[PDB]
Amino acid sequence: YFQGSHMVAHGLAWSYYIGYLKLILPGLQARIRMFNQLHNNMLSGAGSRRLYILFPLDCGVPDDLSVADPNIRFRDMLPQQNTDRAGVKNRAYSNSVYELLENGQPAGACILEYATPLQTLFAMSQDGKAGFSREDRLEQAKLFCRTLEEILADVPESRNHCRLIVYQESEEGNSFSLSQEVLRHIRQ
Amino acid sequence: SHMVAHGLAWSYYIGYLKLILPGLQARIRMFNQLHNNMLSGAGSRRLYILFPLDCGVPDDLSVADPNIRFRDMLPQQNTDRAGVKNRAYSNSVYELLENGQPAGACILEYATPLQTLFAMSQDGKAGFSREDRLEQAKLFCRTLEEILADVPESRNHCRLIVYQESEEGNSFSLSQEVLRHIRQEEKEEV
Ligand SMILES: Nc1nc(=O)c2ncn([C@@H]3O[C@@H]4COP(=O)(O)O[C@H]5[C@@H](O)[C@H](n6cnc7c(N)ncnc76)O[C@@H]5COP(=O)(O)O[C@@H]3[C@@H]4O)c2[nH]1
């Protein structure tokens, strides 16, 4: 295996930064402050004010987080950002806030989502026209993560809000609890 | 199958066109009720997507060509996506002017992934040459065409407008380029 120079993953990483994260990081905290005004400071500490992105390396990305763990419960959306983009007026960028339950009660809350490009990788893997194996998919998923981390390293601290939660579903165990993992990241 | 452009083409199809194209006609019908049948013919069926091969992608179409005039948005599509509840997908409708008056109307936008290719070309960290940016941009278009070819439902609901300004390269008008496509299809209809 020789890793190519500009692979699918490289492009996805750059896409994900240039076309989302870079766009939303400047206003994220303002949106959070607004949310807190409505929700009695639900997102109180710094740890609850990060943008946590789930990165399942097997690329299983359900649209509903509660599917992954029923202890991840949707609470409300942040106020949305609207931006004119590439001829689409008022394109909307949105994020969702979840409560993390322990014993049926909220133990934390945070902004949580999956990394969307992992959906692309999964779909490519399922289409013969794509020419893309399961082995290719895993490697690309790992490369996407590494490349993204490299790009994010260069963000100034005032915009250093992304936090990646990287795991491989097949390697975890029946005792893996995604909500606990997220709470662990919040707590660190 | 491991070039950047492949990923971009699949991203664009899987995460956008596949999602929105099936619902488009209904959104159009509603727009037309609201706006007195502004969209007609294939303008009432297709999303028109601009693919500038040089990867210059202005956010404002009127800046690109003042004869492209924004008129209103389609009603939005909201879909839960990857843990984002009610992610919103929105498209913009424009009138195209000729000699100062409306000559056509359509749903129009740029293919956003070209913006990624442009950005990669400008950041040394990407190690991505201008020459490769061009090749990849061409490849992105071809790949998307290939993907669409096998899915009539999607293919029939979009129009790819591919051009390289600077090979155009003189009297080029973007509005005229769009109108040319609209008119070609109009001649087929009826
Ligand atoms: N989580 C998230 N929420 C967003 O609002 C979002 N916006 C973009 N992205 C992900 O960022 C990267 C860059 O997005 P870009 O717009 O260049 O390409 C996008 C873009 O050309 C288009 N598209 C997606 N949603 C919209 C939309 N609402 N309007 C226009 N084009 C859209 O289809 C491509 C694939 O979209 P996703 O597969 O969702 O992944 C994107 C992509 O990996 C987002 N991811």
d(CA B177, CA B166): 14
Across the interface, whether the CB atoms of A77 and B86 are under 8 A apart is answered: yes
Distance of CA A86 to the CA centre of its chain: 23
d(CA A94, CA B85): 8
Distance from CA of B167 to the nearest CA of A (A): 22
Return the residue matching tokens 């979840």: A98
d(CA B19, CA B84): 15
Distance set, CA A124 to CA A47, A137, B9, B12, B103 (Å)? 35, 8, 10, 12, 40
d(CA B51, CA B162): 5
Beta bridge partners of B162: B51
Say if strands B158-163 and B101-110 run parallel, antiparallel, or are unpaired: unpaired
The 3-state DSSP composition of chain B as helix, strand, coil percent (nearest 5) reads: 50, 25, 30
The backbone region for B37, taken as left when phi is positive above 0, alpha when psi lies in -120 to 50, beta otherwise, is left
d(CA A125, CA B133): 25
Contacts of B82 in chain A (CB under 8 A): 61, 63, 113-116, 119
**What would the two tokens of residue B173 be?**
């008008």
Task: Decide: helix, strand or coil at residue B185.
Answer: helix
Interface of B with A in 65-124 (CB under 8 A): 70, 73, 76, 80-88, 90-92, 108-113, 115-116, 119-120
Atom of ligand 1 at shortest distance to CA of B11?
A: 35
Return the residue matching tokens 């051009």: B163
Name the resolution in angstroms.
1.5
**Does the beta carbon of A20 lie inside 6 Å of ligand 1?**
yes
Distance of CA A119 to the CA centre of its chain: 12
Instruction: Name A46's Cβ contacts closer than 8 Å, sequence gap at least 6.
Output: none
Q: What domains are defined for chain B? A: 1-43 (1.20.5.5200), 44-190 (3.40.50.12100)
Q: Which helix (H) or strand (E) holds B69?
A: strand B68-73
Task: Decide: helix, strand or coil at residue B181.
Answer: helix
Contacts of B11 in chain A (CB under 8 A): 12, 15, 117, 120
Q: What is A96-153 written as a DSSP string?
A: EEEEEEETTEEEEEEEEEE-THHHHHHHHHH-GGG---HHHHHHHHHHHHHHHHHHHT
Tell me if B53 sits within 8 A of B111, measured CB to CB: no
Method: X-ray
d(CA B127, CA B17): 29
Instruction: Name B105's Cβ contacts closer than 8 Å, sequence gap at least 6.
Output: B38, B39, B40, B43, B71, B93, B94, B95, B96
The pair phi, psi for residue B102, each rounded to 5°, is -65, 130
Tell me if A64 sits within 8 A of B80, measured CB to CB: yes
d(CA A75, CA A65): 12
Beta bridge partners of A100: A72, A108
Q: Which helix (H) or strand (E) holds B155?
A: helix B152-155
Q: Which helix (H) or strand (E) holds B73?
A: strand B68-73
Tell me if A147 sits within 8 A of A9, measured CB to CB: yes
Report the C-alpha dihedral over residues A10, A13, A18, A24, rounded to 10 degrees: 180
The DSSP letter of residue A78 is: P
d(CA B42, CA A52): 42
Task: Decide: helix, strand or coil at residue B57.
Answer: coil
Task: Decide: helix, strand or coil at residue A86.
Answer: coil
Tell me if B48 sits within 8 A of B161, measured CB to CB: yes
d(CA A90, CA B160): 22
